[PDB]
RNA sequence: GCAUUC
RNA sequence: CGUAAAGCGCACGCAGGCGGUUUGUUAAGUCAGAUGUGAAAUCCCCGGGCUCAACCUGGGAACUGCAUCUGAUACUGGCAAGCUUGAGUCUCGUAGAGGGGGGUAGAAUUCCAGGUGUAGCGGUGAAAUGCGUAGAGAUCUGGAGGAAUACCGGUGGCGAAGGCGGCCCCCUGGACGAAGACUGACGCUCAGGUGCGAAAGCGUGGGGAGCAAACAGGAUUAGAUACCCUGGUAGUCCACGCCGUAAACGAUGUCGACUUGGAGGUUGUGCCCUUGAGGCGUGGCUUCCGGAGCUAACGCGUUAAGUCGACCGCCUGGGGAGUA
């Protein structure tokens, strides 16, 4: 529901003209979002997300900025949904079949560590090869068990994650995004105007969807 | 261009009163006064081409106004040219 | 200088539709109102209004369907430099009848279909699809 | 510093 | 028709083309119907006849035209009366290398005269021609004359374009803003025409410091009618006339309307005002980057090369040739 924070936007210099409808005014030289318009669209976002959630669909969280990199992972632990916390590899969805073998390599790396077959005297097995696990995990950690294209895309920034939006649009996957004043609309089917980088803003966002998904999943 | 006192004198002479400045008679009379006044200027400064271009605009503007007045009312046009002693 | 006010009315509609503008306002005239009335009847424009007496201003309420402009295309046909008149049998039909052509007949301004039904020709104003 | 041609 | 061929160098403008808005009238254009005519054949449509076809033939349609008659009045035009939003005049201000004329100032170069002073100076990649013991260069004093205006100076300003930089005066053009008043379509464009139009060049008469085609010498080089060096005439400057050409370029004609934005420069103006080398608005001009759209692409992008209207100019493979 409506509460403190989130309303804060960015400077009027970097505003996107396409977002004129969702700006309430230029307060202290920085645009502030119209909350009365955000709640209807936002409430629609959870309702749509709940509907697909009841269909056992797979939701994907896309957060790359350091401010929310750990936040998305926390939601991915509160619910069984998938996420991307670090750089979005170009083509994670367009050529998913190409990325499948990369996931399989991570599984093999994970296995070799579990049963201790990697504890060979050589540093090559001990150090060089095991350093690939965290390199792959930090980028493919939350997508390991997706097993296919997501049924919906959730994005914290529509411009910082413009690559992810393009892939989802190409594949026809519905896109939900926390679109900011400076961000580019028309690439997201469901737009949630508001702040994208404030810590207290995102946590409410991914926290809200992380909840309604659980009720929809049942 | 033209002194305010001289401009006021022409307005009251040709127009209905001191406030009727838009009348074709006032506009034509004002242009004629400046054109005649500038005759001495170009007698001495023969190659003041840049200012002469402005003078030709007044001549062209006066001709357009005179033709409009002639079309609108011939009788008024005939009286005006007689008073100003032009169209020779 | 402005020499074809009708083209300005059509241009404003075309530019406004491309800009996703809710409505377009322009100086009003009897011919513009007559053309606007035909557009409103055919469903191309939601509504139109005239405000002011000394300097009336004509406002047109544009309409959109599925987020795209209803008026796919609108072009002036008869122009001050070249005016076009058509007989009853020569009345054109836009997009094989899906569109309409606004015709200024002796009985007023009406679509090509109306003029054809009435059996009266006249000046072709514009094609709007 | 100058330094052509196939 | 920015770069592929193609926007006159830029303007003013007659003929011509086009023209805001309201009422009445006219019914020329336009539109409807009828009448006369539009020969026959031919073409076309439905039939008939040569064994079929070609071919022949009946009727219709067609001959998109012209003329008259009767009507229609929306649009265009004519006529009459209007209206203010286009355009224009007036009042108060602002900025500017806008133009013409006259005067004047300082720095510097060259030259002339004199003093001090002594063997180099000048120049190049190197060198030489050249200047100098007849006293150069350097340095100081005074005088003469010409040309251009350091700093300010800034993708700053002004002008139709070309173009216009010290300062002062005289004459003078245009632009822009503030409200208010006035005229009431007087407008836009423009073949021909006319005016202006860098530099070089030409004519006459002056002037001539610097610079410098031509020319001369010294170098360079296989040669060097060049680049480099030392000299140097026309010219560059002024007066008046002529020439009318430039990559005269934004390689982008003029006018008007419409269409998301961001950051600057410049010049007016409104308002909040004690919490000023402040806060929010509204005009003119102008630079840069970019959205839609557009474009062959590059790119353009509210100052369009986007979306439209009016008028003019111009292009139709290369070369020959903008030549005979
Ligand atoms: Mg070329
Ligand atoms: Mg070319
Ligand atoms: Mg008219
Ligand atoms: Mg008639
Ligand atoms: Mg016949
Ligand atoms: Mg037969
Ligand atoms: Mg009329
Ligand atoms: Mg001409
Ligand atoms: Mg010269
Ligand atoms: Mg000479
Ligand atoms: Mg001489
Ligand atoms: Mg030389
Ligand atoms: Mg030429
Ligand atoms: Mg030039
Ligand atoms: Mg050219
Ligand atoms: Mg040009
Ligand atoms: Mg003109
Ligand atoms: Mg741009
Ligand atoms: Mg020749």
């Amino acid at each position: 529901m409506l509460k403190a924070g989130v309303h804060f936007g960015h400077q009027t210099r970097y505003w996107n003209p396409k977002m004129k409808p969702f700006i309430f005014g230029a307060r202290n030289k920085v645009h502030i979002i119209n909350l009365e318009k955000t709640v209807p669209m936002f409430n629609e976002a959870l309702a749509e997300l709940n509907k697909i959630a009841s269909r056992k669909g797979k939701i994907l969280f896309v957060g790359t900025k350091r401010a929310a990199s750990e936040a998305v992972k926390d939601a991915a632990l509160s619910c069984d949904q998938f996420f991307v916390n670090h750089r979005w590899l170009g083509g994670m969805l367009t050529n998913w079949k190409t990325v499948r073998q990369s996931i399989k390599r991570l599984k093999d790396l994970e296995t070799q560590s579990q049963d201790g077959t990697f504890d060979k005297l050589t540093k090559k097995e001990a150090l060089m090869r095991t350093r690939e696990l965290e390199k792959l995990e930090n980028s493919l950690g939350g997508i390991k068990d997706m097993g296919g294209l997501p049924d919906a895309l959730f994005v914290i920034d529509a411009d910082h994650e413009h690559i992810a939006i393009k892939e989802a649009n190409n594949l026809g996957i519905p896109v939900f995004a926390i679109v900011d004043t400076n961000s580019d609309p028309d690439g997201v089917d469901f737009v949630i105007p508001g702040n994208d980088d404030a810590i207290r803003a995102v946590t409410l966002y991914l926290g809200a969807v992380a909840a309604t998904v659980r009720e929809g999943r049942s | 261009s033209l002194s305010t006192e001289a401009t006021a004198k022409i307005v009251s002479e040709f127009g209905r009163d001191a406030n009727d400045t838009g009348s074709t008679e006032v506009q034509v009379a004002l242009l004629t006064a400046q054109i005649n006044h500038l005759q001495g200027h170009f007698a001495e400064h023969k190659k003041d081409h840049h200012s002469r271009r402005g003078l030709l605009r007044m001549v062209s503007q006066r001709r357009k106004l005179l033709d409009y007045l002639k079309r609108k009312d011939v009788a008024r046009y005939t009286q005006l040219i007689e008073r100003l002693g032009l169209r020779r | 200088s402005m020499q074809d006010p009708i083209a300005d009315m059509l241009t404003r509609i075309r530019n406004g539709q491309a800009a996703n503008k809710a409505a377009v306002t322009m100086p009003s005239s009897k011919l513009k109102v007559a053309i606007a009335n035909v557009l409103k009847e055919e469903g191309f424009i939601e509504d139109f209004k005239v405000e002011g007496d000394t300097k009336p201003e004509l406002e047109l309420t544009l309409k959109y369907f599925q987020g795209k402009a209803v008026v796919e295309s609108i072009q002036r046909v008869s122009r001050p430099g070249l005016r076009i008149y058509k007989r009853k049998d020569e009345l054109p039909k836009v997009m094989a009848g899906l569109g309409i052509a606004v015709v200024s007949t002796s009985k007023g301004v009406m679509t090509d279909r109306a003029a054809r039904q009435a059996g009266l020709g006249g000046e072709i104003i514009c094609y709007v699809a």
Side-chain angles (χ1 to χ4, degrees), chain A residues 73-91:
Chain A
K73 190 166 190 113
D74 225 31
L77 287 167
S78 98
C79 76
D80 47 343
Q81 289 341 317
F82 317 95
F83 75 109
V84 179
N85 55 23
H86 284 89
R87 167 170 168 273
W88 170 277
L89 309 180

Side-chain angles (χ1 to χ4, degrees), chain A residues 12-18 20 29:
Chain A
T12 194
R13 293 170 36 49
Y14 317 123
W15 87 307
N16 182 15
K18 263 130 190 80
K20 176 134 145 73
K29 208 71 69 59

Side-chain angles (χ1 to χ4, degrees), chain A residues 16 19 62 65 154-166 175-188 190-192 194 196:
Chain A
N16 182 15
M19 270 256 166
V62 175
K65 312 200 281 264
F154 195 78
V155 182
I156 212 77
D157 192 327
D159 256 37
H160 187 286
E161 311 288 27
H162 64 287
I163 288 183
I165 270 52
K166 225 198 82 53
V175 175
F176 307 77
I178 287 76
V179 70
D180 185 12
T181 305
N182 45 261
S183 266
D184 197 24
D186 318 334
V188 317
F190 302 86
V191 353
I192 296 68
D196 67 67

Side-chain angles (χ1 to χ4, degrees), chain B residues 44-74:
Chain B
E44 142 177 25
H45 304 298
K46 212 168 302 285
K47 323 159 172 153
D48 194 3
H49 294 303
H50 284 58
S51 76
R52 201 186 291 271
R53 171 172 150 92
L55 169 64
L56 268 287
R57 200 209 272 211
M58 299 174 213
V59 173
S60 306
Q61 196 71 21
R62 182 173 72 173
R63 179 89 263 120
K64 272 152 204 302
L65 290 165
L66 278 167
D67 296 24
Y68 162 72
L69 187 64
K70 187 210 213 326
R71 175 152 39 78
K72 210 73 177 332
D73 165 329
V74 192

Side-chain angles (χ1 to χ4, degrees), chain C residues 34-98:
Chain C
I35 293 159
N37 193 62
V38 174
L39 296 171
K40 203 268 284 181
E41 184 44 22
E42 296 332 321
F44 290 110
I45 58 172
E46 189 25 39
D47 191 23
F48 68 99
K49 282 282 182 211
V50 180
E51 270 53 87
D53 320 59
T54 165
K55 283 149 63 186
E57 283 266 341
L58 171 56
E59 175 268 25
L60 299 181
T61 304
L62 308 174
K63 54 187 280 161
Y64 304 73
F65 196 70
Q66 258 96 54
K68 46 190 109 203
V70 162
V71 170
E72 184 241 316
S73 67
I74 190 163
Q75 80 175 287
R76 184 74 147 128
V77 173
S78 182
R79 334 185 314 267
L82 174 58
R83 294 195 176 282
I84 310 267
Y85 309 101
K86 297 305 206 204
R87 310 239 281 132
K88 178 191 79 73
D89 40 283
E90 302 176 331
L91 291 181
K93 42 205 319 178
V94 180
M95 290 185 12
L98 304 187

